[PDB]
Design a protein around this ligand. Structure first.
Ligand SMILES: NC(=O)CC[C@H](N)C(=O)O
Ligand code: NA
Ligand code: NA
Ligand code: NA
Length: 419
């Protein structure tokens, strides 16, 4: 089977990427290569990110317009409501698991060591309703601060695709096409044909993923040297985050899939091995979304309309890894500052992490910007975030795997709901 060969190549790519990275790091390291050779060494991994990011805009817009126009607005609303409930519950479970493991293992035992909450949510609302569709294709609204000793929040569009705004518009535009009737049928055919043509490009970029993944993980563990020192002071915090992702991604999420759909959940996860490893390599849910939608449609039996609707929405809203990581970091920082957390402080940590996970941009290093929001809500020192940045390169990659895995299993869950 061609799917099995792709999975075998992807598995070898991750193994070879780790082996190549340690070998390069061990033998000469980044210093021996130098900037002239380091840029070329990681370039094949960068090429995969560029190819994946180039097709996000045509895939997200056309799939959601076609997906929303292929269902009755009442049926689409029910499917969306069920998807949001699954996203909220799983994010809550990830948040609860992260706090529970952090309280149990206590990573902050040996204490050997931004944007406001309102402005963050106002930026989310501004990004949900973009002021320009063309600008939203490569820019997002962000809020900065100016001294006028009172901080005045001034806003302007920064580089970075506004996927959430494009997701919202495409769904609304798709509903408008459905309500148009016969006159909007031509546009439904156009976006479906455009979506199908883009999927042909995905199948070609799909075969380059093992080559890109190998050089993407090899370059990361080469440029991030002194790993042993990192695993010596934050080894327990990394364990809490990675074990929480493993427990939620291999025990909790598969069990939820098994309970509703009485099918093997790890057979579903085997079909999406390539996007999961791509998510690990790229550390972005947006770039691996093209491959996830490719595997979910063909490798698994998920319907075309379900996959093309739930996955683009989940790639921006459903982030189980971000919520678990933020909850562990919030408790870890609290333990470092010797702050005791009672039931009320735990509850607001769960709620704030769930809300902040929805606002996370789904981009590399994009989950630590919302970590400060949780800290101020629960009143913990923010200076300890610098520790999180040291190991974020590894934790974020684990988050991305969990961020997209819930989206795929959610598509499988909602597949049986329609059936
Ligand atoms: N830590 C996080 O989950 C941030 C988002 C993550 N990089 C993703 O794209 O899924
Ligand atoms: Na979730
Ligand atoms: Na996601
Ligand atoms: Na998000």
């Amino acid at each position: 089977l061609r799917a099995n060969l792709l999975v075998l190549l992807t598995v070898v790519a991750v193994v070879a990427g780790v082996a190549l990275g340690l070998g390069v790091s061990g033998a000469g390291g980044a210093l021996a290569l130098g900037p002239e050779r380091l840029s070329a060494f990681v370039f094949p991994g960068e090429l995969l990110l560029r190819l994946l990011r180039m097709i996000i805009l045509p895939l997200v817009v056309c799939s959601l317009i076609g997906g929303a126009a292929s269902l009755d607005p009442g049926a689409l609303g029910r499917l969306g409501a069920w998807a949001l409930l699954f996203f909220l519950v799983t994010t809550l479970l990830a948040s609860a698991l992260g706090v529970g493991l952090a309280l149990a293992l206590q990573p902050g035992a040996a204490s050997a060591a931004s944007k406001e909450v309102l402005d963050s949510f106002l930026d989310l609302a501004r990004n949900i309703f973009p002021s320009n569709l063309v600008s939203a294709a490569f820019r997002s609204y962000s809020t900065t601060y100016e001294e006028r000793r009172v901080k005045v929040p001034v806003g302007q569009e920064v580089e970075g695709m506004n996927i959430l705004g494009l997701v919202v518009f495409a769904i609304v535009f798709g509903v408008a096409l459905r309500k148009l009737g016969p006159e909007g049928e031509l546009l439904i055919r156009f976006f479906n044909s455009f979506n199908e043509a883009t999927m042909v490009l995905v199948s070609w970029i799909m075969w380059y993923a093992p080559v890109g993944i190998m050089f993407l993980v090899a370059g990361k563990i080469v440029e991030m040297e002194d790993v042993g020192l990192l695993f010596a002071r934050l080894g327990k915090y990394i364990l809490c985050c990675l074990l929480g992702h493993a427990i939620h991604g291999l025990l909790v999420l598969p069990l939820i899939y098994f309970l509703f759909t009485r099918k093997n959940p790890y057979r579903f996860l085997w079909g999406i091995v390539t996007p999961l490893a791509t998510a690990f390599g790229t550390s972005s849910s947006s770039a691996t979304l093209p491959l996830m939608m490719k595997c979910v449609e063909e490798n698994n039996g998920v319907a075309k309309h379900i996959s093309r609707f739930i996955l683009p929405i989940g790639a921006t809203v459903n982030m189980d890894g971000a919520a678990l990581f933020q909850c562990v970091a919030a408790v870890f920082i609290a333990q470092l500052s010797q702050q005791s957390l009672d039931f009320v402080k735990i509850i607001t940590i769960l709620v704030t992490a769930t809300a902040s996970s929805v606002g996370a941009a789904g981009i590399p290093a994009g989950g630590v910007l919302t970590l400060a929001i949780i800290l101020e809500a629960v009143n913990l020192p923010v200076d300890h975030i610098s520790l999180i940045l040291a190991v974020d390169w590894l934790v974020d990659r684990s988050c991305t795997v969990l961020n997209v895995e819930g989206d795929a299993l959610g598509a499988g869950l909602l597949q049986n709901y329609v059936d």
